[PDB]
């Protein structure tokens, strides 16, 4: 099938330059065109420009123009994107799509997308806190517990309650910045018989910081 | 500089009802030659890349149900779904391809469900994060709808604003509700000076506000 692959999130200091790739398998890569798409978290898709395999030929939106820099490599099937001189106003997710056949001029396949986050922060780990009720639970129904990352950088944490079993009932949150560290909560809902009876565990990982720790919820 | 504009930004509607809306141009998007706009139209689902639904204005490509119906012609176009589904969650755009491309700010989709007052919790600080040097009291807002929702602070009943941070998720795709999780962070002694901490949600569910609150004395 026809395929479009992308690289993973990529961290980059101010100023700098990022070269991102979008791999084609399973067409003729010199037949189609490739798009380039920004998306902002929680915003729009942006049309960056396209790109014309063979000929190498580049069309860009006004607001692009010197900032991205779309190229082909047709040994490689890749195509490339670059953005020179970050600044946080570059950090979003960068898609790469094929037109489909025709005088479509549609985006019939996507990349899975490139994360750029544009920031002169640091590896942090995170510092996990676990989250337990002030005054013991009435006797019916469910108690909330939680827990508490708090200080890290880059993103993601996974956090997971008592190595994955419990799934029901979670609500981890969107990570909000606070002055170069994020802080996240998860919560979980469960049975007032299993806690404090049973033993309940959040298992905060971060990749970035080479981190797992496993915290255990006291109730006192 | 083609220019396009879609409305509404945002909408709610209930399984097994039909929903439409507007994609709007700046430009004549249909070519004297050919007899086509070039108006296409995408969903994106969370933590998804964008998928084609509809093109030259109301062709649906592969795969795509009957329901999603697009049509227009000009500089006026529509999006219509009926019989919607709780899987068409997601953030619908249109895009231009007359000249260059340019895509909508899109129209955002979530499912209609009863309204459920929100079932909240707060939470004191941990011992390991008051050793630290900081203190951070949390409160959740689970499993509510509608959206919209009003969180209030009180340290020994006196409104708080500042240190406060929330954050939402997306509608939960099985329970159809929204959660928030409010945080209000403190340092070490003004904590520990105070004694009671109160959270306060106001949602249209009631007109008398929902209150859990600690005493910090206790424990």
């Known amino acids: 099938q026809v395929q479009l692959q992308q690289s993973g999130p990529e961290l980059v200091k101010p100023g700098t330059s990022v070269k991102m790739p979008c791999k084609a398998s399973?067409?003729?890569?010199?037949?189609?065109?490739i798009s380039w798409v920004k998306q902002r978290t929680g915003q729009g898709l942006e049309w960056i420009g396209e790109?014309?395999?063979?000929?190498?030929?580049?069309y860009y939106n006004e607001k692009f123009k010197g900032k991205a820099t779309l190229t082909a490599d047709k040994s490689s099937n890749t195509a490339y994107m670059q953005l020179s001189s970050v600044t946080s106003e570059d950090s979003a997710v960068y898609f790469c799509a094929r037109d489909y056949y025709g005088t479509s001029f549609a985006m019939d396949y996507w990349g899975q997308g490139t994360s750029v986050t544009v920031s002169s922060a640091k590896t942090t780990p995170p510092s996990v806190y676990p989250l337990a009720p002030g005054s013991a639970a009435q006797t019916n129904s469910m108690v909330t517990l939680g827990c508490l990352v708090k200080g890290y950088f880059p993103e993601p944490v996974t956090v997971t309650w008592n190595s994955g079993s419990l799934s029901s009932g979670v609500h981890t949150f969107p990570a909000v910045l606070q002055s170069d560290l994020y802080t996240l909560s998860s919560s979980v809902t469960v049975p007032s018989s299993t806690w404090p009876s049973e033993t309940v565990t959040c298992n905060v990982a971060h990749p970035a910081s080479s981190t797992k720790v496993d915290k255990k919820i006291v109730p006192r | 500089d083609i220019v396009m504009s879609q409305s509404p930004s945002s909408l709610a509607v209930s399984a097994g009802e039909k929903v439409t809306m507007s994609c709007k141009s700046s430009?004549?998007?249909?070519?004297?030659?050919?007899?086509?706009?070039?108006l296409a139209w995408y969903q994106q689902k969370p933590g998804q890349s964008p998928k084609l639904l509809i093109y030259?204005?109301?062709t649906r490509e592969s795969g795509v149900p009957d329901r999603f119906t697009g049509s227009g012609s000009g500089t006026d176009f529509t999006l219509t779904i009926s019989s919607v589904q709780a899987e068409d969650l997601a953030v619908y755009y249109c895009?231009?391809?007359?000249?260059?491309?340019?895509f909508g700010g899109g129209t955002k989709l979530d499912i209609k469900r009863a309204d459920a007052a929100p079932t909240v919790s707060i939470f004191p600080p941990s011992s390991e994060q008051l050793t630290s040097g900081g203190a951070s009291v949390v409160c959740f807002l689970n499993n509510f709808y509608p959206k919209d929702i009003n969180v209030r602070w009180k340290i020994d009943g006196s409104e708080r604003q500042n240190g406060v941070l929330n954050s939402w998720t997306d509608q939960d795709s099985k329970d159809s509700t929204y959660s928030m999780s409010s945080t209000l962070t403190l340092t070490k002694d003004e904590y520990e000076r105070h004694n009671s901490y109160t959270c306060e949600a106001t949602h249209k569910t009631s007109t008398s506000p929902i209150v859990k609150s600690f005493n910090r004395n206790e424990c």
């Open positions: 895009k231009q391809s007359f000249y260059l491309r340019t």
């Open positions: 430009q004549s998007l249909l070519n004297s030659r050919t007899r086509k706009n070039y």
């Open positions: 030259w204005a109301s």
């Open positions: 399973g067409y003729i890569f010199t037949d189609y065109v």
């Open positions: 790109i014309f395999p063979r000929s190498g030929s580049t």
